[PDB]
Design a protein around this motif. Structure first.
Motif, PDB file in Angstrom:
ATOM      1  N   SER A   1      -9.927  -5.149   0.846  1.00 49.84           N
ATOM      2  CA  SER A   1      -9.905  -3.703   0.819  1.00 49.84           C
ATOM      3  C   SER A   1      -8.772  -3.124   1.654  1.00 49.84           C
ATOM      4  O   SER A   1      -8.181  -3.803   2.485  1.00 49.84           O
ATOM      5  CB  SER A   1     -11.238  -3.173   1.342  1.00 49.84           C
ATOM      6  N   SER A   2      -8.477  -1.854   1.415  1.00 44.83           N
ATOM      7  CA  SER A   2      -7.429  -1.161   2.142  1.00 44.83           C
ATOM      8  C   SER A   2      -7.927  -0.776   3.540  1.00 44.83           C
ATOM      9  O   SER A   2      -9.110  -0.486   3.727  1.00 44.83           O
ATOM     10  CB  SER A   2      -7.017   0.089   1.356  1.00 44.83           C
ATOM     11  N   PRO A   3      -7.038  -0.786   4.549  1.00 46.33           N
ATOM     12  CA  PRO A   3      -7.474  -0.415   5.902  1.00 46.33           C
ATOM     13  C   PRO A   3      -7.938   1.051   5.949  1.00 46.33           C
ATOM     14  O   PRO A   3      -7.263   1.939   5.406  1.00 46.33           O
ATOM     15  CB  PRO A   3      -6.226  -0.683   6.750  1.00 46.33           C
TER      16      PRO A   3
ATOM     17  N   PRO B   1      -9.032   4.637   7.888  1.00 42.01           N
ATOM     18  CA  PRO B   1      -8.787   5.439   9.094  1.00 42.01           C
ATOM     19  C   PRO B   1     -10.098   5.406   9.899  1.00 42.01           C
ATOM     20  O   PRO B   1     -11.177   5.712   9.365  1.00 42.01           O
ATOM     21  CB  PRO B   1      -8.448   6.829   8.528  1.00 42.01           C
TER      22      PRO B   1
ATOM     23  N   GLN C   1     -10.230  -2.827   8.771  1.00 44.79           N
ATOM     24  CA  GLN C   1      -9.948  -3.422   7.474  1.00 44.79           C
ATOM     25  C   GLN C   1     -10.804  -4.623   7.097  1.00 44.79           C
ATOM     26  O   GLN C   1     -10.667  -5.698   7.666  1.00 44.79           O
ATOM     27  CB  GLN C   1      -8.473  -3.840   7.358  1.00 44.79           C
TER      28      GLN C   1
ATOM     29  N   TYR D   1      -1.154  11.162  10.613  1.00 40.31           N
ATOM     30  CA  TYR D   1      -2.369  10.422  10.339  1.00 40.31           C
ATOM     31  C   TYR D   1      -2.436   9.839   8.924  1.00 40.31           C
ATOM     32  O   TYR D   1      -2.387  10.567   7.932  1.00 40.31           O
ATOM     33  CB  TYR D   1      -3.522  11.402  10.640  1.00 40.31           C
TER      34      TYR D   1
ATOM     35  N   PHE E   1       2.421  -1.158  13.494  1.00 42.25           N
ATOM     36  CA  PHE E   1       1.011  -1.545  13.598  1.00 42.25           C
ATOM     37  C   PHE E   1       0.863  -2.738  14.537  1.00 42.25           C
ATOM     38  O   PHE E   1       1.807  -3.502  14.720  1.00 42.25           O
ATOM     39  CB  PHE E   1       0.459  -1.979  12.241  1.00 42.25           C
TER      40      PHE E   1
ATOM     41  N   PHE F   1      -7.467   1.500  12.766  1.00 42.32           N
ATOM     42  CA  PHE F   1      -7.902   1.335  11.392  1.00 42.32           C
ATOM     43  C   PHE F   1      -8.799   0.112  11.292  1.00 42.32           C
ATOM     44  O   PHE F   1      -8.584  -0.892  11.985  1.00 42.32           O
ATOM     45  CB  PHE F   1      -6.709   1.136  10.464  1.00 42.32           C
TER      46      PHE F   1
ATOM     47  N   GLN G   1      -2.140   1.204  15.824  1.00 39.61           N
ATOM     48  CA  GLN G   1      -1.005   1.888  15.164  1.00 39.61           C
ATOM     49  C   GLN G   1      -0.386   3.032  15.978  1.00 39.61           C
ATOM     50  O   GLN G   1      -1.085   3.791  16.656  1.00 39.61           O
ATOM     51  CB  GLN G   1      -1.422   2.442  13.799  1.00 39.61           C
TER      52      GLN G   1
ATOM     53  N   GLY H   1      -4.111   3.731  -0.588  1.00 32.13           N
ATOM     54  CA  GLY H   1      -4.363   3.246  -1.925  1.00 32.13           C
ATOM     55  C   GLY H   1      -5.075   1.909  -1.772  1.00 32.13           C
ATOM     56  O   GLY H   1      -5.121   1.346  -0.689  1.00 32.13           O
TER      57      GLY H   1
ATOM     58  N   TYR I   1       0.796  -1.220   0.000  1.00 28.96           N
ATOM     59  CA  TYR I   1       0.000   0.000   0.000  1.00 28.96           C
ATOM     60  C   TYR I   1       0.838   1.286   0.000  1.00 28.96           C
ATOM     61  O   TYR I   1       1.968   1.318   0.483  1.00 28.96           O
ATOM     62  CB  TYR I   1      -0.894   0.060   1.249  1.00 28.96           C
TER      63      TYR I   1
END
Lengths: 20, 224, 213
Positions: free
Chosen positions: C41-43, C45, C37, B107, C97, C35, C88, B112, B95
């Motif tokens: 898919s992407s983690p 915020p 997830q 932050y 993380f 985060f 994180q 992506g 990523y």
């Protein structure tokens, strides 16, 4: 003292940090 | 729309190198730090390094210092991460993420979609696609189940849709399975109302980019 | 690099329950981040700077903590919360993380809708015969899919695959496909799939006779 974010490299705090 | 665009997948030969892209839009690329994160089921989310596009300045995690090289292009607003001499341990999801607000503290608020990397010497193999036909059964049923067996392909991933993306509700595309033969297998099913089996035509579209193969299969109902 | 240890690894929560997950660090950190997830898919915020909620994150979520002990807590668990939540930290370089706490919804019982799929005509026109058994939208995850060939229970020659828990109805789907050669597939008549699951009254069987229809 080394910042994870490169945009810190020239900051007042990083420069002070190197002044151990 | 602040956004970070990364390619979906890359197949690398063990020993080779790969340079990944991460295009940015919706904000000025040179005023934010771009970060790269590695992800595997076994070693979790690992921070690789970061770069500041307005400087070229870079920061690395000692662990990936000799494995990754980070670069940024101002005109095309793209960040890059080159992975050298890849081994099986490099197979993972990668990523890119922008960081912001040093205030409280940083932050990772824009990530992506991630580019999945597979390092293998094996040759690319297209998928064979067979229909999973809905019989009439002993059960009258109100809803029938339709499917598509996408098997014996390499490497992941394979995209499967229904009717050009028109049918999405009730679809379940199962996780791929590495067969004893070293090839992957997969299944995609959809439930639909029984009475539509004669009016509607159901097509499953398989896309396996890494072998330039696109197949559209008609799954034909069976009068049983 | 600071080590973030999360717990519990898996947190089972019934819809409507109030749950909390912890995060501990090898040495003090000023703020902790969270985060969310979902697989593939992407983690996303979820919580920044220990207690703040990210854009589009419901009030049910919250976070607090100090020094080496932090926590994320959901006041009212809902279906769309299934996912792994990750800890994180930014206090030390390299930022790290946590291992993540997977949350899964313990919804009410749901029986699978079972369907059995005979091998295609094109497939045997290649020498291989795959028979698929489908278990749709069920809970809990524990289900026994047993292949019967000519009334005899089979084993070891079939693979299973499960989807992740659905965000709207919180159930799973499972595919179990038996694979065998055309030559061996032609040695039997009745191919069946027997399913036992908490949800159905009695173990159901969906089958078919080779080459009948």
């Amino acid at each position: 003292c080394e910042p994870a974010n490169p945009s810190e490299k020239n900051s007042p705090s990083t420069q002070y940090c190197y002044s151990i | 729309q602040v956004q970070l665009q990364q390619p979906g997948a890359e197949l690398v030969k063990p020993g080779a190198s790969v340079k990944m892209s991460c295009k940015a839009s919706g904000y000025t690329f040179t005023s934010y730090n771009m970060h790269w994160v590695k992800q595997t089921p076994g070693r979790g989310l690992e921070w690789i390094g970061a770069i500041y596009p307005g400087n070229g300045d870079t920061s690395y995690n000692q662990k990936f210092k000799g494995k990754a090289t980070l670069t940024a292009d101002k005109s095309s607003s793209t960040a890059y991460m080159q992975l050298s001499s890849l081994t099986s341990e490099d197979s993972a999801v990668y990523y890119c993420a922008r960081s912001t607000y040093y205030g409280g503290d940083w932050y990772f608020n824009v990530w992506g979609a991630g580019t999945t990397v597979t390092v293998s010497a094996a040759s690319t193999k297209g998928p064979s696609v067979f229909p999973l036909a809905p019989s009439s059964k002993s059960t009258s049923g109100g809803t029938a189940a339709l499917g598509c067996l996408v098997k014996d392909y390499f490497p992941e991933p394979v995209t499967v849709s229904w009717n050009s993306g028109a049918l999405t509700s009730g679809v379940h595309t199962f996780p791929a399975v590495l067969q004893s033969s070293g090839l992957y297998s997969l299944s995609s099913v959809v439930t639909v109302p029984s009475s539509s089996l004669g009016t509607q035509t159901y097509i499953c579209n398989v896309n396996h980019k890494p072998s330039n193969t696109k197949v559209d299969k008609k799954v034909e109902p069976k009068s049983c | 690099q600071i080590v973030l240890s999360q717990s519990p690894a898996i947190l089972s929560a019934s819809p409507g329950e109030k749950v909390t997950m912890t995060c501990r660090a090898s040495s003090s950190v000023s703020y902790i981040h969270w985060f969310q997830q979902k697989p593939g898919s992407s983690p996303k915020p979820w919580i920044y700077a220990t207690s703040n909620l990210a854009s589009g994150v419901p009030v049910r979520f919250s976070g607090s903590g100090s020094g080496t002990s932090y926590s994320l807590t959901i006041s009212r668990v809902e279906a769309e919360d299934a996912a792994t939540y990750y800890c994180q930290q930014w206090t030390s370089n390299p930022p790290t993380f946590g291992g993540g706490t997977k949350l899964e919804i313990k919804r009410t019982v749901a029986a699978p809708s079972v369907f059995i799929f005979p091998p295609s005509d094109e497939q045997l026109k290649s020498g291989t015969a795959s028979v698929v058994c489908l278990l749709n939208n069920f809970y809990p995850r524990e289900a026994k899919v047993q292949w019967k060939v000519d009334n005899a229970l089979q084993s070891g020659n079939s693979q299973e695959s499960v989807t992740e828990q659905d965000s709207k109805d919180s159930t799973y789907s499972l595919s179990s496909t038996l694979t065998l050669s055309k030559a061996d597939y032609e040695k039997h008549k009745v191919y069946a799939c027997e399913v036992t699951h908490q949800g159905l009254s009695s173990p159901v069987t969906k089958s078919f006779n080779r080459g009948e229809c």
